[PDB]
Design a binder for this molecule. Structure first.
Ligand SMILES: O=C(O)[C@H]1[C@H]2CC[C@H](CC2)[C@@H]1Nc1nc(-c2n[nH]c3ncc(F)cc23)ncc1F
Length: 156
């Protein structure tokens, strides 16, 4: 499996861990069957885009943590969407609200890039502690000191 690759306009580089691929069929939130390569394992990545930078920890169909820095709200949102799709989480699969048309991961990404409101509302939030250098981000992509999208923090 490749150590560096591109997804959603971000260069990903695996800095720790490894995964194996297992083909699985998942049911989307539009009741469509999708055949995807699910990655199994613990991994850490960097993400570098033109307008945002992040560190992503993940496990099998599970986002662990995304620490993201970006130029503005929109640029941060772009990184979050890519990370949420990349995670392969079921809540992301179940947030699909269209029939998808081609690589299935790319179709998922394009769908959420078009409108991420259901993705962000269904993802979940959590309370956060005041940690120096970080802040929370709400489903509407605005900041909060007290709560954040689950597993997501913004570097500031
Ligand atoms: O699976 C693919 O066809 C490609 C598509 C474009 C980039 C990504 C994500 C989709 C994937 N390629 C690659 N994906 C991965 C990978 N590691 N861990 C993952 N967890 C979820 C995932 F979803 C993809 C990966 N490691 C090396 C790759 F080279």
């Amino acid at each position: 499996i490749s150590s560096s690759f591109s997804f959603g306009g971000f260069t990903f580089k695996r800095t720790s861990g490894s995964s194996v691929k297992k083909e699985e069929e998942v049911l989307t939130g539009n009741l469509q069957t999708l055949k995807i390569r699910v990655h199994e394992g613990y991994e850490e990545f960097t993400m570098v885009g033109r307008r945002a930078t992040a560190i992503l920890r993940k496990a099998t169909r599970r986002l662990i943590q995304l620490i993201v820095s970006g130029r503005d709200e929109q640029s941060i949102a772009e990184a979050i969407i890519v990370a949420m799709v990349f995670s392969q989480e079921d809540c992301m699969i179940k947030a699909v609200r269209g029939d998808l048309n081609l690589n299935p991961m790319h179709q998922l990404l394009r769908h959420f890039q078009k409108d991420a409101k259901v993705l962000f509302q269904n993802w979940g939030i959590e309370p956060i502690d005041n940690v120096m250098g970080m802040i929370g981000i709400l489903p509407d992509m605005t900041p909060s000191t007290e709560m954040s999208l689950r597993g997501v923090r913004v570097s500031k």
